[PDB]
Structures are given as C-alpha cells and as structure tokens.
Amino acid sequence: HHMRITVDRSQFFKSLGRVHRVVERRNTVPILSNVLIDAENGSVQLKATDLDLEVTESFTVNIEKAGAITVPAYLLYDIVRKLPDGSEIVLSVDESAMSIVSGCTHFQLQCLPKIDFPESLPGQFGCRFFLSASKLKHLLDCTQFAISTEETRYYLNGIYFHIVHDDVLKLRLVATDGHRLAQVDMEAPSGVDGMPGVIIPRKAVGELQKLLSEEIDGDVCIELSETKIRFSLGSVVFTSKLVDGTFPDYQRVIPLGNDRKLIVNRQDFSSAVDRVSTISNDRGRAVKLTIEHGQLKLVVNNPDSGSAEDQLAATYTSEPLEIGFNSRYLLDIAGQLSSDEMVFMLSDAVAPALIRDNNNAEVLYVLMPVRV
C-alpha cells in the first residue's frame, strides 16, 4: 500500500505538535527521529516514541489511499509550520519517500517504512479508572516542580502515584528532589482499590502537562500495571514505562509537629526574596530569615558580589529564629500558592519547614533549610 491523504493544514499541525516533541533532538537512532503516519479506515494516526514514552494522536480524514510511512518529525513540523493556515496538504508515497504538496509548494522527503518503527504488544493493565482532566492537571501542577532532575537519584526523577488507605481512600501524588517535597491528595475515584504505588517518569509528566496546559475537557482514562502506565484523553494516548525502583518512605520527612508559625503576605515575601537573591551566583542561593515578633528580616551574602537585606511585616509570636533556605526554592513554593497568606510551620534552624496556603487542606509542601 502507498499512502495518499489530503489533510487540513491547521488540523495536521495541531496533531503533529502534540506528538513530535516526544522525539529527542539528541537522539542518534534514525527511526526514532521520525513520526509514524498511519492512514486507514477514515483516520490518520500520528505516533512518536523514544522507547520509554509513546504518544499517539488520531484525527478523522477521508483517505484516498490507505497506507503508512515514517517521516523525520522536527523537519515535518517545521515544514507544516510554514504552510498557510486554511490551506490543504497532500501527503503521498510513490513506488521510501513521501511527497508533500501544498499549492505550488512540493517537498520530497526521505523516509523510513512503518515496519522499521517500534510497535508494542497491546497494553495489559490490571488497574483502570477515570479522572477529570482538570483534576489530573491540578494534581500534576501541585507536584511537577519538585521532581528531581539529578541523574544520581533516578527513582526521584518522577512522581510517586499511590493510594493512601485512610478512612476514605485517597489518591496521592508525591514528588521530591531531596530538598523540596510536594504532596497532594484527593478522594480516590472508583476502581483504584489495590492500585500499586508507581513512579511516573519526569518526561511523561512533562509531556502530559504540556497537553493538559491547553485546558482539556472531559475525563482521562488511566490504566496501569507495575511496569507501564497509560493516559487516554481526547484523541491522544500517552503510554510510559514506570520507573523501576522503590520510592522513599517520604512520610518520615513531613513535619507534623512543628510548633512555630510564621504568616507573611505571599506577594511581599516573594518580591523581597526575589530582590535580595539578585546577588547570588553558583556558590549558593541561601537567604537567611531572621524571624522576630511581628517582623521578618531577609539577608543574602555572596563573597563575589556583596550583601542584600530587606524587611517585611509578619505575623509571628514564637521564640525568635534565624533560619536559612535556598531562595529559588522559596520562590518555587511561593509560586505554588494562590492565597494572599503564606504560612510556614517551623521548628529549629536545621529541621524541615512545612509550607502551605493558609487556606487549603489537600496540598502541602516541605522545604529543608540550609545553614546560614
């Protein structure tokens, strides 16, 4: 079979945009730089993979001649980006090369056949349930920023997706890099009894988040085993290996007994930290908080540039405390919160801090101090 399809440029561009970013630019195995185009039975499916994560998107097209072909994905994307909105594109294979015709513009691209492209066996999943896309986005929004990117901590390079057998079952996501930790809970949907705790890889989280950022309607079908997880939403399917490791006993680090409470105006605190951290560099990003009754002072020292201080009103009635934090991590967590009021539950200067929006009960953050 030798494919021939006529597609709407804007539709094709949107679908290609969803799949092509899975391809690694640093990749050296030729077939893995390509997107598979598969046209059959009134539908075109685009597939890309890096062997750990696979993405497919499909759309309805009247097919002139069924067939399939794989095409270098970034090149195809860059070509379609430059073709005019509201135009049509004819993609066709002759008797491994693909023709692209749009108006008088005609490309002939060196391709590779579908048979070379990775195809998996059908997924076998022991657990299947649904979440709204908006809820899944909320869970990932609470936790993605805290994921480790350190190569020496591979089973921290993802999100621990697991059930908490409270009175009411909870579905929980935790991420940490050893300095920041994020924990979010929801009431568990039906169908997650017995669900294994799994580590969703950082890359899958990131690609899922890029799709979810478009504000997707409806539900996501989540399927998993102890080796793979699949997210189906709209016309898109993400299938990812799971991280093969055991996530740490993270409940040990969440300080539920901290007894010094600091409340600050979140925006005023964020802007002050942003200002004084301007002098920091690769040596570190420490900011010292000197906490007294009603008052917070911030100090940053960098031997290559100088010093920086600021002061804010605060609600604080406990024993005075001097405690240091990574200023970027403080801004990261302040950025997670939505309320005017940012609350720190503190202990001593080298004990983890518990941070949250003064309001909410489902999300918490933990941040380790640094010495100052």
């Binding site: 901590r153 921290l156 940490t176 050893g178 300095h179 930790l181 740490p248 006993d249 993270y250 040990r252 680090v253 570190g284 990574n326 080298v350 983890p352 933990v366 380790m368 101090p369 640094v370 010495r371």
Partner: peptide, 10 residues
C-alpha cells in the same frame, strides 16, 4: 545543604 531525612536518600 542538608537533605530532607528521606529513607533512603537524605
């Protein structure tokens, strides 16, 4: 720059 007392990991 201590780590959280993660078990394992710190």
């Amino acid at each position: 720059v201590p780590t959280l007392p993660l078990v394992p990991x710190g």
